[PDB]
Design an enzyme around this catalytic site. Structure first.
Site: not given
Length: 304
Positions: A29-30, A66, A79, A280
């Site tokens: 994630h991210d 992102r 982020h 994460d």
């Protein structure tokens, strides 16, 4: 041995006649937040400490990018409002490098607008990604560009499949690559049809849950994926969670509890379908606990 023991190329050991959807895939994630050093800001904005190449080495195949439009020709990794100290090109080159060295892996790259464009931009996020990345000759042959709605590991191996979170796009290959794009419910478990109704996307992205409710949301989608051998269903299951402002309940704290738990759950279930689990701090290990990436990888049934 387990595919876990060779994370750098677990997908080569698979039967490539499999659709990416039926593969159990670890994602981060991210993905690009690894650059952050600031201790205060990292509580809430940092979700990874391993860089791209190290992530891929540890077996991550789904990447959550992102971005923000910095200029009519440029996308920065972000982020939300926090800039992650690099442009998209950088992820693309690491990815190209990695695929060149492990040409039997596919990388799925998610692409999302995560903050307002620089005041100087005159183009949309979708136009810039399309024209200055996806259709850029720089990255010729890097992207999947076939027309299969549900591509297999053979068709995508050595390539990036776009996972489209831009909205409607004029791009024509990848998940949600139509002028309808993917309808994304906020902080929900949801289900929506993508690719002119070819696929059924089932997502748990309840990013504001607390520990207990998140574990539950994750396990609920997990228990669905397990009894579902439909290759037209694609599971995206985010284990990651938001921290908020000051509190020292960092994303890392949440991860240190959720990852091991879901991981122990996957192990117990043996070789059942999990879908794509986005986590994460991919590859961060805690002595005495099950590793989520390794557990995801090992849930793939070897048959051929």
């Amino acid at each position: 041995d387990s595919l876990s023991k060779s994370p750098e190329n677990w997908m080569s050991k698979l039967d490539d006649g499999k659709h990416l959807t039926e593969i159990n895939i670890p994602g981060s994630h991210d993905s690009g937040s690894f650059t952050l050093k600031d201790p205060v800001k990292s509580v809430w904005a940092k979700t990874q400490d391993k860089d791209y190449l190290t992530q891929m080495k540890s077996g991550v195949r789904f990447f959550d990018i992102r971005g923000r439009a910095s200029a009519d020709n440029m996308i920065s990794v972000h982020h939300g409002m926090v800039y992650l100290h690099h442009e998209l090109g950088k992820f693309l080159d690491d990815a190209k490098y990695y695929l060149s060295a492990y040409p039997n892996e596919t990388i799925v790259m998610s692409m999302k607008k995560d903050y307002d464009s620089d005041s100087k931009v005159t183009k949309t996020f979708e136009e810039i990604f399309r024209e200055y990345y996806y259709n850029n000759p720089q990255y010729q042959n890097l992207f999947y560009t076939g027309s299969n709605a549900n591509p297999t590991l053979k068709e995508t191996k050595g390539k990036i499949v776009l996972f489209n979170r831009m909205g409607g796009t004029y791009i024509k290959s990848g998940y949600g690559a139509d002028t309808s794009g993917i309808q994304w419910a906020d902080n929900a478990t949801f289900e929506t049809k993508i690719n002119n109704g070819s696929l059924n996307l089932k997502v748990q992205d309840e990013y504001k849950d607390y520990y207990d409710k998140k574990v539950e949301a994750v396990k609920n989608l997990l228990a669905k994926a397990k009894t579902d051998s439909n290759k037209d269903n694609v599971y995206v299951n985010f284990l990651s969670v938001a921290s908020g402002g000051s509190a020292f309940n960092s994303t890392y704290n949440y991860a240190s509890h959720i990852n091991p738990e879901i991981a122990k759950t996957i192990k117990a279930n043996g070789k059942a379908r999990t879908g794509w689990l986005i986590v994460d701090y991919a590859g961060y290990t805690w002595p005495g606990y099950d590793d989520i990436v390794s557990e995801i990888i090992d849930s793939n049934k070897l048959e051929h």
